[PDB]
């Protein structure tokens, strides 16, 4: 029951001929599965971790200028030179300065003036990469057995460390069976080019070419003891005031500039090893061996009592906590809902089949009633506990919310959203292929466009579609305008 | 600032976004607009740091 009240869950009910269902585990969002004859169990991502970090392009963020030296040559007899300039430890650039009888020349004329300074490393900022092999994924598995206090519990569950070596794993649940996990870490994220840019006590996710494009001097990135920098002219400026001398300044500390720069980067944790959060992984669930506990259990007949208050969570599901009062340890709980005093029995018991394992402390049921005002009974007889409920909303509202949720899923998850909750249907695969090619062509156009610019481009193209002449107007307008507007509305999040 | 100085147009010296204070050097400056420098990040739901 780790999934209750998370604000991001999504029901994925369904199976296939050989009983697999695939699902993308968005980090920080847990998916819940259902079946006619299988237990409803909850899956949540946790702690995509890495090891054996490889470092390259160790940057520099603050300089230190020492050993200021300068050399001048008389006008019109060649450029000034310094034997010290060749060494890579020196930054040096020559301007022109007028040279006169007042500063010891032969004749009045412009002359070269090299000035060199000893750039020194200070507070380097390293950016490491990850060997793709070292990526490690952990998936927690919680089944919906109601315990005394297992509501949204996070430590409870069974970990399954899934690495690209062990793409397939078992999951030995207590007295339920083995849940199969087929995975595909290759398409989790393009980790072939991510860089883990570690700050003082922070670390981030960046794109490779952007990282190579940070306008700061860079080092070899190896474990050397005396790094040699390149493009050292960036962190040092030369002040040539009205052409009389040359002084050198170190241009301060670019820390805040960096913190402002990474305005779209995600976050990880750096504590010994780094547990990189913020990633999605698809997993083809295998429901081969799951079997319900207490299928042959006897349905007990006695009165029930409502220990805790009924309280409904977001997006339509309610929690019932009830303790059995009787003598049947193997009891299974009866359930039926009658709205309008009819026999409709409409709705779904979201939990598989609740059973009272032990009498003393309640086992808590979860169920999803229909939209209309519907009563819910539990036991049997006159004293059978009956609970009224009134869910607010209509079916069209649920449809609209589901559509919006699916759109948000598609925009963030790219081309894998069609793999989400699939069965293997021929229609679904073709839709995924078409959306994949179209979206790849689309994002090829907008690699690097921002919030407001995407909104404005969408407005411009929806206008050019609206007033155009030939039948391309509808294709351009609908497709590009709607896609760009809906991406501008929900991005950077 | 530090060992360096500059001349900037006055109208531009209040519109650059940073915290600012009365400049009374009373050892306990109560900074106006402290929100601009410090930044809150909220992870996926849950806590806040």
């Amino acid at each position, epitope marked *: 029951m780790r999934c209750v009240g998370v604000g991001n869950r999504d029901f994925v009910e369904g199976l296939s001929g050989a009983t697999w269902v695939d699902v993308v585990l968005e980090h920080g969002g847990c998916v819940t599965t259902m079946a006619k004859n299988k237990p409803t169990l909850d899956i949540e991502l946790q702690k995509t971790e890495a090891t054996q970090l490889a470092t390259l392009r160790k940057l520099c963020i603050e300089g230190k200028i020492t050993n200021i030296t300068t050399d001048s040559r008389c006008p019109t007899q060649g450029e000034a030179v310094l034997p010290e300039e060749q060494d890579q430890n020196y930054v040096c650039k020559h301007t022109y300065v007028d040279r006169g009888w007042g500063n010891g020349c032969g004749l009045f004329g412009k002359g070269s003036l090299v000035t060199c300074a000893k750039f020194q490393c*200070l507070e*380097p900022i390293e950016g490491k990469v990850v060997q793709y092999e070292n990526l490690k994924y952990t998936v927690i598995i919680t089944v919906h057995t109601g315990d005394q206090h297992q509501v949204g519990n996070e430590t409870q569950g069974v970990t399954a460390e899934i690495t690209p070596q062990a793409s397939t794993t078992e999951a030995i649940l207590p007295e339920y069976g083995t849940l199969g996990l087929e995975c595909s870490p290759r398409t989790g994220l393009d980790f072939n080019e991510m860089i883990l840019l570690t700050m003082k006590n922070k670390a981030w996710m960046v794109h490779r070419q952007w990282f190579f494009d940070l306008p700061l001097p860079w080092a070899s990135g190896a474990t050397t003891e005396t790094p040699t920098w390149n493009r050292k002219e960036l962190l040092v400026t030369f002040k040539n005031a009205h052409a009389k001398k040359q002084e050198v300044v170190v241009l301060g500390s670019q820390e805040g500039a960096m913190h402002t720069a990474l305005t779209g980067a995600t976050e990880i944790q750096n504590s010994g090893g780094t547990s990189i959060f913020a990633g999605h992984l698809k997993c083809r669930l295998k429901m081969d061996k799951l079997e319900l506990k207490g299928m042959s259990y006897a349905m007990c007949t006695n009165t029930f009592v409502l220990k805790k208050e009924v309280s409904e969570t977001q997006h339509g599901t309610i929690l019932i906590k009830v303790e059995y009062k009787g003598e049947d340890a193997p009891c299974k709980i009866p359930f039926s809902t009658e709205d309008g005093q009819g026999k409709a029995h409409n709705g779904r018991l979201i939990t598989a089949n609740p059973v009272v394992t032990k009498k003393e402390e309640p086992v808590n049921i979860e169920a999803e009633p229909p939209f209309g005002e519907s009563n819910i009974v539990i036991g049997i007889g006159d004293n059978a506990l009956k609970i009224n409920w009134y869910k607010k909303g209509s079916s069209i509202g649920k449809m609209f919310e589901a559509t919006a949720r699916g759109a948000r899923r598609m925009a963030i998850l790219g081309d894998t959203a069609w793999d989400f909750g699939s069965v293997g249907g021929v229609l679904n695969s073709l839709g995924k292929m078409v959306h994949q090619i179209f979206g790849s062509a689309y994002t090829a156009l907008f690699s690097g466009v921002s919030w407001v610019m995407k909104i404005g481009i969408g407005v411009l193209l929806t206008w050019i579609g609206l007033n155009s002449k030939n039948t391309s107007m509808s294709f351009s307008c609908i497709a590009i305008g709607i896609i760009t507007l809906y991406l501008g509305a929900v991005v950077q999040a | 600032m530090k060992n360096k100085a500059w001349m900037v147009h006055r109208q531009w010296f209040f519109d650059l976004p940073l915290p600012w204070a009365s400049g009374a050097t009373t050892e306990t400056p109560t900074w106006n607009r402290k929100e601009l420098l410090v930044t809150f990040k909220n992870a996926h739901a849950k806590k806040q740091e």
Partner: antibody, heavy 122, light 109 residues
Framework: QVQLVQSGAEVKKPGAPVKVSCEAS????????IHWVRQAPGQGLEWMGW????????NYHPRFHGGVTMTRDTSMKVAYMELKRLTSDDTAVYFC???????????????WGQGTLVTVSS | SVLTQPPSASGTPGQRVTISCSGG????????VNWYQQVPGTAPKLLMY???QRPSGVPDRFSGSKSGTSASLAISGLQSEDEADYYC???????????FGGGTKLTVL
């Protein structure tokens, strides 16, 4: 409490590298500085360079870049300094001190160790 | 620039003697000065962990501040146990290094 053992004094010959270990426990070592100030007999003491344990590089005094090196480890909370070249000049006791990262606190050397001593001779 | 402080003598009767520290326009005129006294032969301790703030040094008799390019320290009721070398150290911001002084041989009679 917070202190720096600074191991024990050792003396060597010219032309070889010597090491001075310097461990400070009792507090979170990451945030604070290590300064490595040298002190000659009957002379004033001059500071050379910081080392930030978490991410810091060497920032030696202009007299001493390319003359000394500084390393550290975060797991054991110890800062290492070694002398890549021993001339006849460096005949003194080398220190450690905790420094703050405040602009007014770059010279804030609140805590000091015993002082590992090294001299060079034939 | 670079800081230079003079060595001087004093006597065990209580008297105000000023250990003046002189610097420049980039090292001490803008930054917090730090005052150290060392018992000879061992590790120097810190006497003033701010411009005019003492962490745990002998209170009410060790107090000083800085004026423009000069920083100073004042000691009152100086006895023999205060035999120490006094150091003023300031952070140079142009050269990105702290600037320790030569040292004062403060001898008290």
């Amino acid at each position: 409490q917070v202190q720096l053992v600074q191991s024990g004094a050792e003396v060597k010959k010219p032309g070889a590298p010597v090491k001075v270990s310097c461990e400070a426990s009792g507090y979170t070592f990451t945030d604070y500085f290590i300064h490595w100030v040298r002190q000659a007999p009957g002379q004033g003491l001059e500071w050379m360079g910081w080392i930030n344990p978490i991410s810091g590089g060497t920032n030696y005094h202009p007299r001493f870049h390319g003359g000394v090196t500084m390393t550290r480890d975060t797991s054991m909370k110890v800062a290492y300094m070694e002398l890549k070249r021993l001339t006849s000049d460096d005949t003194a006791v080398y220190f450690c001190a905790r420094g703050r990262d405040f602009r007014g606190g770059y010279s804030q050397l609140d805590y000091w160790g015993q002082g590992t001593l090294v001299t060079v001779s034939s | 620039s670079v800081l230079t402080q003079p060595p001087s003598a004093s006597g065990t009767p209580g008297q105000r003697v000023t250990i003046s520290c002189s610097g420049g326009s980039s090292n001490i005129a803008i930054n917090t000065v730090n005052w150290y006294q060392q018992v000879p032969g061992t590790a120097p301790k810190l006497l003033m962990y701010s411009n005019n703030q003492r962490p745990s040094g002998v209170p009410d008799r060790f107090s000083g501040s800085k004026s423009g390019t000069s920083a100073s320290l004042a000691i009152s009721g100086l006895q023999s146990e205060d035999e120490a070398d006094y150091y003023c150290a300031t952070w140079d911001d142009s050269l990105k290094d702290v600037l320790f002084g030569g040292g004062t041989k403060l001898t008290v009679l």
